[PDB]
Amino acid sequence: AEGVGNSSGDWHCDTKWMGDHVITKSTRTWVLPTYGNHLYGPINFDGTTGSGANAAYAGYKTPWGYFDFNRFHCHFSPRDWQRLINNHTGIRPKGLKIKVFNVQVKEVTTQDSTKTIANNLTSTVQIFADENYDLPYVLGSATQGTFPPFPNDVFMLPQYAYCTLQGNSGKFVDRSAFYCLEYFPSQMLRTGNNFEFQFKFEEVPFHSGWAQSQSLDRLMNPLLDQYLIGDYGTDASGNLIYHRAGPNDLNEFYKNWAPAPYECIQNINSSDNTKNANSINGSNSTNKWGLQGRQAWDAPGFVQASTYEGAAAGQSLLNGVLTFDKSSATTSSPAATAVNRTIEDEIQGTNNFGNARNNIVAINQQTKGTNPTTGSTSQFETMPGMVWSNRDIYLQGPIWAKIPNTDGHFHPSPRMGGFGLKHPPPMILIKNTPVPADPPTTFNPMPQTSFITEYSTGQVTVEMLWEVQKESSKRWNPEVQFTSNFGTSDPAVDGIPFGINNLGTYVESRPIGTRYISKHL
Amino acid sequence: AEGVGNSSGDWHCDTKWMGDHVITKSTRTWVLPTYGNHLYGPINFDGTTGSGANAAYAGYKTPWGYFDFNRFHCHFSPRDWQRLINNHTGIRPKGLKIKVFNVQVKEVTTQDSTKTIANNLTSTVQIFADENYDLPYVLGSATQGTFPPFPNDVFMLPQYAYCTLQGNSGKFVDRSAFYCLEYFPSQMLRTGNNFEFQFKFEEVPFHSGWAQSQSLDRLMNPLLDQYLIGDYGTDASGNLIYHRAGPNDLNEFYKNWAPAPYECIQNINSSDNTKNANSINGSNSTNKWGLQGRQAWDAPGFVQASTYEGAAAGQSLLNGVLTFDKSSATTSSPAATAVNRTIEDEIQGTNNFGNARNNIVAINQQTKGTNPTTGSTSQFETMPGMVWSNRDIYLQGPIWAKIPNTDGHFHPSPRMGGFGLKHPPPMILIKNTPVPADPPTTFNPMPQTSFITEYSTGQVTVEMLWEVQKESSKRWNPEVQFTSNFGTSDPAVDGIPFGINNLGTYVESRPIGTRYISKHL
Amino acid sequence: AEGVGNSSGDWHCDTKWMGDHVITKSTRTWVLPTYGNHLYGPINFDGTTGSGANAAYAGYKTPWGYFDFNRFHCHFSPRDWQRLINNHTGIRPKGLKIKVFNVQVKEVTTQDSTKTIANNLTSTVQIFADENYDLPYVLGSATQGTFPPFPNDVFMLPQYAYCTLQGNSGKFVDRSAFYCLEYFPSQMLRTGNNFEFQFKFEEVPFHSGWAQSQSLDRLMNPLLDQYLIGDYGTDASGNLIYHRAGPNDLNEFYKNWAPAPYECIQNINSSDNTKNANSINGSNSTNKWGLQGRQAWDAPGFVQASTYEGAAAGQSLLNGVLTFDKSSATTSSPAATAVNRTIEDEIQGTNNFGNARNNIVAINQQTKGTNPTTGSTSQFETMPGMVWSNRDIYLQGPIWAKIPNTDGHFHPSPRMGGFGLKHPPPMILIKNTPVPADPPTTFNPMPQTSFITEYSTGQVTVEMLWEVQKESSKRWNPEVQFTSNFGTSDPAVDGIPFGINNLGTYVESRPIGTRYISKHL
C-alpha cells in the first residue's frame, strides 16, 4: 500500500515460553526465478529405458512456485529443541500465521559482454493460498526445497508440478486431470504491498515424547504367582498335566496384551563391516508393495525397533530407519560420513525387533500317532488386543502429512512421522507476472512468446503456536538427557558442531529424537 | 480421631437391587506382616540356570504392601451372581467407595521359650492411594493375594515389587527406574482413625451377556434365492458359466459380513484320554510372541470357540481357555480333579473353532494349461467387515485391566476378560511404620537397622455401584438358565457345593460364565 | 515512513549549560561496507608460530557491524571541555538518546573498465539494540573504530567478532558458544525511515575532579605534639625508653589512615635519554598476570603516581600510564613525536610513587643476642584503613566499562578509567540485507552465494545528559587552570593546535586531564 520509500514490514525472530504453550517466530529471505518461460509442459517418462517399467509417470509442469516450510528445524534451533525435549513430554501444533513482504523485482539485461541487473519499480508478483484443497497437494513427500536451517542463508523456491493417472507406458487416460492455476483468484503484490495469512489446526493427540522403562512381557509382580492354571504337557498315557506359573519362570504367565504387528525386514549392520554379506542388492532385498500392475518400495514401513539392549553394536534395519544429510547437498550418492542415521531404541518395550521373526503358531491338528508341530511366521498382522508406539519426530524430519481422502483408513499416522491431518496448512503458490517484449508493428493474432527476463526476491515470516505438556514423575534416580559430548574441534576445519564450518556451510552434527524421558508403561 | 474405647466403624454387608443399578457392599479382615525388615532389595534372575534365558528379570522389593480386590467373586455371592446372569443381559461398573478402619497394632516378643503378643497402643500405619498413576501398576496380572471368596476368612496382604527394563542377563540399564515410596504423601493411622476413599469410573460399554442363537453363515431367508449371480465354473471351451444361489444350497450366497480373525491354536481333549497324543510338550507346542530378543507365551490369546455343537465331548483348546482352582491353594501342579476348566460354546456363532483351520485362499494365477490351486491358511488376521465377540467374564475372573499408555491400540479389551480402562481404580498401599530398638549410648552416625517386630490388622470395606440392563425378548420357548444339578453330597466329606467342606475350607464347585440368555444376531 | 523526497531528520549539534546539568548533542555521517560476503567464519590463531602460545584465540566473525561511541572527545569539544574542568569538580552521566536516519543504499557495478555507483531506491538495512545483554559485549576494550573527534569527517563502522573459550592450541571445547545474530528481532530501515532509541543510566558516584593540596603524612597541626607516647628504642640494659612526638619531627606521629596498596612497576624516563638502561626488553620487564595456563600483560594496573614534585623531569612508569596518538593513524610503531603520554601528578598525595618501593616490615623475632631486622616489600596489598584515588578521565579516554557478571568484585572501577556499570548502554548493530544475483533457471537446492555488491551510508546523532557539581572553595590565592601556551604555529605546516593542519587531518596537541582544581584532603 505505502510508497516505495517506506518499508512494508520488519524482521521478527523469537521464541517465548509462556506456559503450557510456546510461540516460535522466524524470518528468512527468498528468491524466485522465472520457470519454464511461462509455459505449461507435459512431462512423462516411459518405462522403456533406464530404471524400468516401475518408474513410469505422467504429469504437468507449471510456471508457479511455492513455499514448503514443513520440517521441524525451520521453527526451532538446536538449543531451543534441547530445551523442549528434556523438560516436556509432548507437543502438538495449535495455529500459525504467515506473512510475506518487502517484495522487489529486478530485471536482467545481457549484452553478451556482461549481465546488467536494474531494479524495476513497476511489476508485480501473484500469490494465493488455496483454501479448498483443489490443487494436488505435493507437500508431505519429503522433497527438498524447504527453508534452510540457518536463518542467514537465502533459498530458492521450487517449481510446482504434479502426477496424474497414467495408462500403460506413461500415457494419459480419461480420468487424467489438467489444472490451470490462473483460474484461481490471487493477489498482485507490488513493492510496498504485503500478503498476510491466518490458519488454525484441528484437534490432534499429543505426540508421545517419552521413552518407556518397562516391557510387555513383564507387567507383573515378580514375587507372586497366578491363580490361573495352564497346561504343561501330557502324560505318557495321554492324560492332561497342569502347572502353575510361579516366579521361577515369568514367561509362562497368561498376559492381557500383545505386542505390535510386524513385517519381516532384512537386517543390516552399518558400522561393523564383518557382519554384512558381500554385495547384496538393495533393490532386490527390500520390502515392496505393488499397485496398478507395478510395484514400489515400502519404506520405512510400519515402525520396528532398530536394535534392542544387548544386541551387537551397529545393528540396524535395511531401509527401516530414516537417514539425513549433515548439510543440504545435491549429491546423489553421499559418503557414509556425511549422513545421520537414526536408530529406534526407545520403543523396544512394545515393538519387536524388526528382523527377529520370533512368533510361532501351530500348523497341524494333533491326534493319536501325530505329534503337534509349530512354525515361525514371517508376517503377523493386527489382531484385537495389540499395542504399538509410533515413530519418533526428529528435529530434521517432517512436521505433518495430509491424510488421503478415502472411504477408510486405519489409525492414520504418517509412516515417516509427525501429525496426520485431514485439513493441513494450505499450500501457498507464487509467480511473477509476465512482461512482454516489444511487439511487432502490425497485428499478429498469435500469442506472444517473447518476454523480459526477471526474478523476484523478498522476505517471509512464519509464526507457529505450539502446545506442550510438562509432567511430574516421581522416580528417584536421574534421567538421561540430551547433551553435547564432542571432545574438541579445530576451527581450521569443522568449526563448532551445529555451527558454521570453515567454508561457510551450516552443518548438523547428529540426529536428535524426542524421546529422552523414561516413563513406565 | 476418637479415643481407644470407641469403635471407628461398623460392619456393612448387603446387596440391594434398586433398579437399573445394583449396589454391593462387603467387609473383611486383613493382617499385615512386616516385610523385608524395612529394606529395599534389588532382585534379579539371570538366564544362566534353571528355566532359561527367557525367564530373566530385574527389579526391586519394597516394605510396602497393598490391597488387590479385583476379582468378581469378592463382590458377589454365588446366589447373587445367579440372580444377575439369568435376568440381566449386561453389566458395567459405575463407581466405588473404600474404607479401612479398626486398625490395631501388636508386638511380638520372643523369649525363645515362647512368643508373647502384647497390644501396642501407640504406633501407626501409613496408607495412601496413588491418584496420578506414578507407581508401576501391578494389578491386572491375575496374581494371587485377592480377597478370599468367603467373608469369614482372614487374608494376608501381598508385598509390592516391580520389574523395570533389563539389559542382557538381567542387569539394569540407563532407562531403569527406582521409585522411593516414602516420597509420596500419605496418612498415618493410629487406633481410632479411619481412611476413606472415593472413586468414579469412566464410561465403558456394557459387557454383552447374551449367548447368540444364530450364525453368520445363515443370516438369510431360507425359502428364497438371491438376485445376485455367481460363477459356477467354466465350460470345456473356456466360456464362463453362471449359477444362481437357491435354497437347495445355502453356502453359495454372497454375504455381507465375515467371521473373526484367528491364529491356529493346538487342540487338546481334556476328558477323553484316547484322543490326545502321547507325551506332548506343553512349552514347545504353545503359541508364542517374541519381544526384545526373547519370547514369552501368548495365552490365552484372542478368543476362539473351545468347542462347537456336535463336536466330540471334552474337546478344548490348549492354553486357549482359562482355568481356576476349586479353592485357593499354593500347589504348583494340582491334580485334574481340583481345577475348573472353562469352555466357550456361546460364541460359536461368530467365532470359528480355534484349531479348525478351514479358511482357503487362491495361491496362483490361472491361464491356459495351468489349473487354479488353493490352500489353507494357518493364520488369518483382521480385514474390513469382520465381527467377533469378546471373552466372557467369569465369577472367578478379573474385573478390569489397565490399558497400557501407548501411541495406539486396536480395540482394547483384555484378552483375559473384563473392562479395559484408561484410568483404573488406583492402587492402595499400606505399611506399618518402623519402631527402633534401644540405641547405643554414644552417637553412631550409621543408620539404625534394629527394629521391634510387629504386625497390624483391621477391617476393610468395599462398596461397588453397578449398572445393569434388563431386557425383553419375545421368543416363545423357555430359555436355559443356571441351576444346581448335583445329586447329593456327604457332609462327612465334601459338604454342600459352594459351601464349607468338612475341614473348614471353602470350595467353589464349577465355573460360572455370564452368557445364559439366547439373543439372535 | 515518509517518501523518497522528504528528509527523515535534520542536523543537531549543540551544548547548553542549564544548571547543575549539561546536555551535549552531535551528529556525524557513517558508511557501512558489506563484510565477509554475508558469511560467518570461524577464526583462530594457534600458538605454534609468531607471537607465541600466549597469543592463541578462537572465535567467530560476523557480517554485522556496530557503532562504538564510547570516548569523551566524541561528546565535547576542546573548548567545551575546558569550560567543564576549570569550573566544575565532578561529572557523571545521566541518560542518552540516539537516532539514526537518512539512510541511503548504493550499488557498485564493475565493468573492469571503471566502477559505476548507482543509487538503489529499494533495499534495506537491519538494525537492533540489544536490551538483555545476550550478545558478548565487545565495547570497553578500547579498540579503534570510535567516532572521529571532528564532526566533518566520515567514518567506517567496524566489523563484529568475539572470542569464546578455547582448548589447548586454540581449539573449541564444550562450553564454547555460537551466536546467530539473525535470531534477534530487528527493524528494517528503507530510505525515509528512522531508528530511535532511549536509555537511562543507573546511579553512580561523581568522578572526583579535584587535585588534592595536602598529603596523608601531614594531616596534623604542625605547632603541637601528641598526647600519645611511643617507643624510641631500648636502653643498654634492655629497659624500654619512651619519646613524645613533637613538632621537631613530624614523621613520628601516630596516624589514623594509610596510603594506597601497590605493586612495584618498573620506572622509565621518557624525555631524558641518559637515565634509561640500554636495550631493555618491554615484554620481559612488564608486570603480568597469568590465567588458564598462560600469562597476559597487566597494564596499566592499579593507579600509581607517575612522578612526584621534586623528582627528575621526564620520570614515568613503564606501561603504567596511558598513551594516545595525536591523530587517528594505523601505524603499528609510531614515533615519539606523534604520541601524547599522560602523567599522574594530581594523586601524589594519597598514592605512592609507583617504583618507590619504600615500605618496610619486620622479618624476625627479637630476643637476647639477636637484633631486630627489617626489609622492604616489593608488593603490599589492601588492608583496613587505606585510602586511594582512582585514575583520571582524559578527554581522549574511554567513558565507561561493563563490570563483568561474577559472584564478587572489589571496588569496581575500570583500571583504564571512567564509570563502571552493571548495565551499560546497549550495543547497536547494523547490517545491510543481502540482495541475490540472478538465479539459474532450474531449481538448485543449495543455498545462494552470489550477491550484489553494495554499501550503505547515513547520519547518526547522539544526545547525552550530564550531571555536574559546581563548588565553592574559600582559598585565597588563585588556582591553576588549563590554558593554551603554544607560542606560534606556521599555517604552512601544522596549523593551529586542536585544529586542522595543512593536509586536512585533525590533530590533538596534548592530553587533557580533569584535575586542575586544588581541594584539601
Side-chain angles (χ1 to χ4, degrees), chain C residues 449-506:
Chain C
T449 58
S450 64
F451 291 152
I452 290 172
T453 301
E454 64 183 342
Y455 64 92
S456 297
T457 185
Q459 286 82 0
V460 60
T461 183
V462 177
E463 183 178 2
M464 292 296 295
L465 173 60
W466 297 95
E467 183 69 15
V468 299
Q469 290 183 337
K470 187 181 293 294
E471 80 291 3
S472 62
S473 178
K474 296 184 74 67
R475 64 175 294 176
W476 182 258
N477 60 344
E479 294 180 350
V480 298
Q481 288 180 334
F482 174 77
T483 185
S484 62
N485 295 133
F486 71 95
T488 188
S489 297
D490 183 5
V493 53
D494 57 354
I496 293 173
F498 292 91
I500 288 98
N501 67 343
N502 190 341
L503 276 69
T505 61
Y506 176 83

Side-chain angles (χ1 to χ4, degrees), chain A residues 335-373:
Chain A
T337 61
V339 297
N340 297 133
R341 184 174 177 83
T342 62
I343 60 173
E344 299 299 324
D345 61 352
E346 297 85 355
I347 58 175
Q348 65 178 20
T350 63
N351 289 279
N352 187 27
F353 171 74
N355 193 30
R357 187 176 177 273
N358 283 335
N359 287 276
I360 289 172
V361 66
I363 60 173
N364 67 343
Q365 303 177 339
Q366 72 169 17
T367 191
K368 300 300 286 188
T370 183
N371 296 131
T373 59

Side-chain angles (χ1 to χ4, degrees), chain A residues 208 213 217-218 225 231 234-235 237 242 244 252 364-366 379 381-382 384 389-390 475-476 516, chain B residues 54 56 144 165 175-176 178 266-267 273 280 294 297 319 325 331-333 355-356 379 381-382 407 415:
Chain A
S208 296
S213 65
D217 55 352
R218 312 291 188 268
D225 53 353
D231 297 346
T234 58
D235 184 68
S237 297
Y242 294 92
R244 188 191 299 272
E252 305 308 332
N364 67 343
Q365 303 177 339
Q366 72 169 17
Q379 59 176 18
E381 293 90 359
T382 60
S389 180
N390 292 337
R475 64 175 294 176
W476 182 258
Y516 289 90
Chain B
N54 290 282
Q144 290 175 333
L165 281 176
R175 302 290 182 188
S176 297
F178 172 80
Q266 191 63 61
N267 62 28
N273 189 341
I280 67 173
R294 63 185 180 276
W297 284 8
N319 294 132
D325 292 344
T331 302
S332 65
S333 176
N355 193 30
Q379 59 176 18
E381 293 90 359
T382 60
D407 294 343
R415 289 189 175 181

Side-chain angles (χ1 to χ4, degrees), chain C residues 228-235 239-245 254:
Chain C
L228 295 175
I229 312 301
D231 297 346
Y232 181 76
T234 58
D235 184 68
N239 294 131
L240 178 61
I241 294 173
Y242 294 92
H243 185 274
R244 188 191 299 272
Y254 293 169

Side-chain angles (χ1 to χ4, degrees), chain C residues 339-474:
Chain C
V339 297
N340 297 133
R341 184 175 177 83
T342 62
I343 60 173
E344 299 299 324
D345 61 352
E346 297 85 355
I347 58 175
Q348 65 178 20
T350 63
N351 289 279
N352 187 27
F353 171 74
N355 193 30
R357 187 176 177 273
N358 283 335
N359 287 276
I360 289 172
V361 66
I363 60 173
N364 67 343
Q365 303 177 339
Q366 72 169 17
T367 191
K368 300 300 286 188
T370 183
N371 296 131
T373 59
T374 60
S376 65
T377 59
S378 177
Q379 59 176 18
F380 187 81
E381 293 90 359
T382 60
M383 289 180 67
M386 290 180 180
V387 295
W388 63 89
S389 180
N390 292 337
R391 188 183 297 275
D392 187 357
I393 56 170
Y394 296 89
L395 175 65
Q396 299 172 335
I399 297 175
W400 63 81
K402 179 175 178 290
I403 295 170
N405 187 341
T406 53
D407 294 343
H409 50 74
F410 173 67
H411 184 64
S413 61
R415 289 189 175 181
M416 291 194 287
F419 302 92
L421 297 176
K422 295 291 179 64
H423 299 84
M427 178 175 65
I428 292 171
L429 276 66
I430 185 170
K431 69 171 292 184
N432 52 348
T433 187
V435 175
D438 52 351
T441 61
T442 60
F443 175 82
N444 188 30
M446 297 298 293
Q448 297 296 100
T449 58
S450 64
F451 291 152
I452 290 172
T453 301
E454 64 183 342
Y455 64 92
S456 297
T457 185
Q459 286 82 0
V460 60
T461 183
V462 177
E463 183 178 2
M464 292 296 295
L465 173 60
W466 297 95
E467 183 69 15
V468 299
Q469 290 183 337
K470 187 181 293 294
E471 80 291 3
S472 62
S473 178
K474 296 184 74 67

Side-chain angles (χ1 to χ4, degrees), chain C residues 123-247:
Chain C
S123 180
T124 58
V125 299
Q126 299 175 338
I127 180 170
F128 69 92
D130 178 67
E131 293 302 321
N132 296 339
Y133 300 93
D134 290 343
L135 296 173
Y137 182 84
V138 297
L139 276 69
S141 178
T143 60
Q144 290 175 333
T146 308
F147 300 172
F150 186 78
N152 190 31
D153 293 345
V154 174
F155 70 96
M156 178 173 172
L157 299 179
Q159 192 172 359
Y160 177 76
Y162 62 91
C163 298
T164 57
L165 281 176
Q166 61 180 20
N168 190 340
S169 297
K171 297 182 182 300
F172 295 103
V173 295
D174 299 349
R175 302 290 182 188
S176 297
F178 172 80
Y179 296 94
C180 176
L181 273 61
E182 292 83 354
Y183 182 78
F184 290 86
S186 69
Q187 179 177 352
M188 291 180 180
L189 269 59
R190 185 181 291 176
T191 301
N193 294 283
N194 59 346
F195 173 80
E196 295 174 349
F197 179 74
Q198 185 70 255
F199 184 84
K200 186 177 67 64
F201 291 93
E202 64 184 343
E203 295 301 322
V204 291
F206 289 90
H207 180 275
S208 296
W210 62 86
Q212 56 191 20
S213 65
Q214 286 182 333
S215 174
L216 288 176
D217 55 352
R218 312 291 188 268
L219 289 178
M220 61 194 82
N221 183 338
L223 294 174
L224 296 178
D225 53 353
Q226 288 176 334
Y227 58 86
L228 295 175
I229 312 301
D231 297 346
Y232 181 76
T234 58
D235 184 68
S237 297
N239 294 131
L240 178 61
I241 294 173
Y242 294 92
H243 185 274
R244 188 191 299 272

